[PDB]
Amino acid sequence: QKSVKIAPGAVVCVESEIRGDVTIGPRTVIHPKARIIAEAGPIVIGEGNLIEEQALIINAHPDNITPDAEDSEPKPMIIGTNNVFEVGCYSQAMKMGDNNVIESKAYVGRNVILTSGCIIGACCNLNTFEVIPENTVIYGADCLRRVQTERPQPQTLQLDFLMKILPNYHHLKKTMKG
Amino acid sequence: STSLLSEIEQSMEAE
Amino acid sequence: EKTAVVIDLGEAFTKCGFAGETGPRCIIPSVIKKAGMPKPIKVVQYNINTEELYSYLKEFIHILYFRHLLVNPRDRRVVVIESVLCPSHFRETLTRVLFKYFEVPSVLLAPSHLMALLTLGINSAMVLDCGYRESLVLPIYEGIPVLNCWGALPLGGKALHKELETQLLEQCTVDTGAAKEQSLPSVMGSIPEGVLEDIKVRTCFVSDLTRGLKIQAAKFNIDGNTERPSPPPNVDYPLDGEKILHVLGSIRDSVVEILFEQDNEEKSVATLILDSLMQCPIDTRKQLAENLVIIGGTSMLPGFLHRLLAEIRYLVEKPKYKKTLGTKTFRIHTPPAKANCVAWLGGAIFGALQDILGSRSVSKEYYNQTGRIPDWCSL
Amino acid sequence: ASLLQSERVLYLVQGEKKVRAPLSQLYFCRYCSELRSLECVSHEVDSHYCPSCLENMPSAEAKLKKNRCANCFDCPGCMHTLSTRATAYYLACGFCRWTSRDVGMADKSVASGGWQEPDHPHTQRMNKLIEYYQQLAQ
Amino acid sequence: MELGELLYNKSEYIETASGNKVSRQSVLCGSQNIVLNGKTIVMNDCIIRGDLANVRVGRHCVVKSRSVIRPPFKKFSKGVAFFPLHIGDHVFIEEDCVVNAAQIGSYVHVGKNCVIGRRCVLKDCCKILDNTVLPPETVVPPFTVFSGCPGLFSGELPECTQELMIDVTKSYYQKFLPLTQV
Ligand SMILES: Nc1ncnc2c1ncn2[C@@H]1O[C@H](COP(=O)(O)OP(=O)(O)OP(=O)(O)O)[C@@H](O)[C@H]1O
Ligand SMILES: [Mg+2]
Ligand SMILES: [Zn+2]
Numbered sequence A: 001q002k003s004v005k006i007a008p009g010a011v012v013c014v015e016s017e018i019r020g021d022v023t024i025g026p027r028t029v030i031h032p033k034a035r036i037i038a039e040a041g042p043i044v045i046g047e048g049n050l051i052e053e054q055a056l057i058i059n060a061h062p063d064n065i066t067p068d069a070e071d072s073e074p075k076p077m078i079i080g081t082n083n084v085f086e087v088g089c090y091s092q093a094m095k096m097g098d099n100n101v102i103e104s105k106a107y108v109g110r111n112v113i114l115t116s117g118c119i120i121g122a123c124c125n126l127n128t129f130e131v132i133p134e135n136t137v138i139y140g141a142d143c144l145r146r147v148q149t150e151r152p153q154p155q156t157l158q159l160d161f162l163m164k165i166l167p168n169y170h171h172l173k174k175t176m177k178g
Numbered sequence B: 001s002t003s004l005l006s007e008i009e010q011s012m013e014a015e
Numbered sequence C: 001e002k003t004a005v006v007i008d009l010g011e012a013f014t015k016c017g018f019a020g021e022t023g024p025r026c027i028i029p030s031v032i033k034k035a036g037m038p039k040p041i042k043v044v045q046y047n048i049n050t051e052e053l054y055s056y057l058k059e060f061i062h063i064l065y066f067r068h069l070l071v072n073p074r075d076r077r078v079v080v081i082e083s084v085l086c087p088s089h090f091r092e093t094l095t096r097v098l099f100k101y102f103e104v105p106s107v108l109l110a111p112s113h114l115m116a117l118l119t120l121g122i123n124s125a126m127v128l129d130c131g132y133r134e135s136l137v138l139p140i141y142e143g144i145p146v147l148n149c150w151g152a153l154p155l156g157g158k159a160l161h162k163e164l165e166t167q168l169l170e171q172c173t174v175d176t177g178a179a180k181e182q183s184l185p186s187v188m189g190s191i192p193e194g195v196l197e198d199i200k201v202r203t204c205f206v207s208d209l210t211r212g213l214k215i216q217a218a219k220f221n222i223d224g225n226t227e228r229p230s231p232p233p234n235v236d237y238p239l240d241g242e243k244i245l246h247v248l249g250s251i252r253d254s255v256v257e258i259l260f261e262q263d264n265e266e267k268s269v270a271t272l273i274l275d276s277l278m279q280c281p282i283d284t285r286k287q288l289a290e291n292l293v294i295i296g297g298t299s300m301l302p303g304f305l306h307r308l309l310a311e312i313r314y315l316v317e318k319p320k321y322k323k324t325l326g327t328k329t330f331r332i333h334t335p336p337a338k339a340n341c342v343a344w345l346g347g348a349i350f351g352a353l354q355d356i357l358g359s360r361s362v363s364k365e366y367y368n369q370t371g372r373i374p375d376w377c378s379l
Numbered sequence D: 001a002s003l004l005q006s007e008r009v010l011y012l013v014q015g016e017k018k019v020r021a022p023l024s025q026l027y028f029c030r031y032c033s034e035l036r037s038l039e040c041v042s043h044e045v046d047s048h049y050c051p052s053c054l055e056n057m058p059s060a061e062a063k064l065k066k067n068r069c070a071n072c073f074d075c076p077g078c079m080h081t082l083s084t085r086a087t088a089y090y091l092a093c094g095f096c097r098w099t100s101r102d103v104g105m106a107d108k109s110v111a112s113g114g115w116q117e118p119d120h121p122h123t124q125r126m127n128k129l130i131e132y133y134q135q136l137a138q
Numbered sequence E: 001m002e003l004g005e006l007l008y009n010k011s012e013y014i015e016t017a018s019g020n021k022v023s024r025q026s027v028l029c030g031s032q033n034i035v036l037n038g039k040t041i042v043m044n045d046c047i048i049r050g051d052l053a054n055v056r057v058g059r060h061c062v063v064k065s066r067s068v069i070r071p072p073f074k075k076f077s078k079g080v081a082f083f084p085l086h087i088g089d090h091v092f093i094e095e096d097c098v099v100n101a102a103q104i105g106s107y108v109h110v111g112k113n114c115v116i117g118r119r120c121v122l123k124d125c126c127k128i129l130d131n132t133v134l135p136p137e138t139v140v141p142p143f144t145v146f147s148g149c150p151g152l153f154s155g156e157l158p159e160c161t162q163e164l165m166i167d168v169t170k171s172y173y174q175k176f177l178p179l180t181q182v
């Protein structure tokens, strides 16, 4: 069974598509039409990672080779805390650090590792694989233009306000106790 | 003003 | 009287602004973006039909006068800085564009070298302009450009970009990132001019005299055993996002050696000044040797001036120049403006001289009456 | 404009220069019955306004301030309007996270007016030179 | 060049009293809060997020498919809230668009595959070329094209944009007639 059990406090809407044995933290918010597909293995999401609109997170088995590596090859996707997944983001990184925001209409490669404080600019692609250093902003569509940043910045107040306003308009998924 | 929900309800009523 | 505008057109960059200013307000690539064509067209092109050049100059000057200078063209005079021995047809086409279309009051076709001289306050020096298209040496003695002793070589930024492209295409090692993390030489047929320019300005540098000579000798490597100096570390220049061109360390200091390489002809950037000086009048030499002014974008490369002065002093001792220019003290000037816009700064200083600028410049009434622009060719 | 392909239909404009252009890009002088093109017509500057803060600027102020807005700043990494942020204020860009702290400009207590451009080092010698050449020109 | 025909199946659309033609597949959220002024076209897979703040949209505007109208979030000193989104009359939003603009004026045309940053202000008669990102707090003045990544002023629209655009949007509405139920 694709267990959709989520910790208390989640504001995932029934319109937001989630499939596979997912795992989401308590304070995470998920907006309608967010897609979280977990076909290769379970997805672990920490507290505060808000998901917006057309955010397609697929833990898809690599079709570039597909050699049946290690039989099932679970490879659980671990996602940090106090993260932001803006509209149109297309994330596939297996590991994500806390304080991570990816701007709208961004591609994240399967083999990329996202560390703490990193930011992905809008209309950018990260098909190339490597670990992102801390507090690295990637901006521009012509190229990547990696630039070091002095500090990160969370969006907790927006998440709290969303927790206030969302359940009045949309019916959150009435997940039973984990 | 006529909210879009009201227009949708009126369209449903017409059907 | 309203402040006169100043324009300095060049193949690589055009410098624009107002007179009596500490520096140019605008400095942009000399291109115009025509619709439908991805890579824009060079505004200043020699040996083309006059209609196309007229249209290009019209569009570019309109961009200058209504995007960068926020002022009408009719009101204010113009001080156009054009290099000596500029192609004639381009010059009369430019003046025709300025007069017939924009109806400016008057355009002063000042020479770049004399204007560059005006910035320092001196009235005599050997001005070398290392432009994009070619390097050009001209001596000025008491405000009189000595055209008889001119010199020029095609060792500007264009030749340097071509050499950089050739060396990169030879020692190409680019990580495409799509199942090509290993070196994949010459994945792209030709590098665009912008990428070459950025690589040249950012990575490449001019090595010391001794290191440069050792590099030149080790290029032949006739019976040599690792005589080259140890190169700087390689630099991984990103292209197009995913691609990463591993610009080799050797290129970074060997690409610019074409400027200073003799190659069995005794012609280089450094030797150019000595060749011009040896042709000068006997009395003018010393004042021209002690006053050297270097301008142009290529001269702004790091370590260029030190290598140039060292090469000058090195070539002075050679038998060709030992008899005449042997016991001379060369000294470089440091004008207030950056070497990109020293000529523009001279034109700007000349622009605020409102009283003379009316008489020296060519009035539009005179151009309409005659249609012949003054030039140092026979009239 | 581009939704309907205006370039498909090209009207010719009479005059010294024969130019074919879309009808939307042509102007019809009523005193001269022949319609006139954008290349044939003469352009003049009517007013200056800052695109970020849509404040009209008089021409004298434009000359004094060197055709630059008094408040807005353009980010150097990418030509985008820098935004003031408070912790006691500093400029930070929206697209790339270029902050004023990177180049090392101390935080200004006031919101907008604190920030200023450096003075050109060679402005004094420029004034000396221009004065000398002015008297020589005289 | 006139606007070509673009037929739609009548089953998956709702025509309203005011004349809005809103697709069934469009993701309307907080529809009690959304307001359309009439003659509006909302295509399939349009995510109009009215559950956060007042999203009012003017007459004859076109919101092509796979376009999201999400009001922006502003963090003011007194606290936090969501700014209402306002769109003027005769706005042509191309498909695969992302709109976080505080205000879009009238006679505006957003190119296809475009993302507009938070709290952007688009004045009347402005264009955004395709594959363009407007970072937050970007103000587009009237009669200007904002193109590139980031969007930078790179041209001016013709004189008759107020007339051409109101012709184009009206033609688009008049040519968006339902399929023949044969
Ligand atoms: N700041 C800089 N540092 C290093 N190189 C530079 C710099 N600015 C320009 N260049 C290079 O200098 C050359 C352009 O020189 P410059 O701007 O003086 O020429 P130009 O006026 O456009 O041309 P020309 O005088 O031949 O008409 C090009 O190689 C450009 O890459
Ligand atoms: Mg030059
Ligand atoms: Zn401003």
Ligand SMILES: [Zn+2]
Pocket: D075, D076, D077, D078, D079, D080, D093, D094, D095, D096, D097, D098
């Ligand atoms: Zn920036």
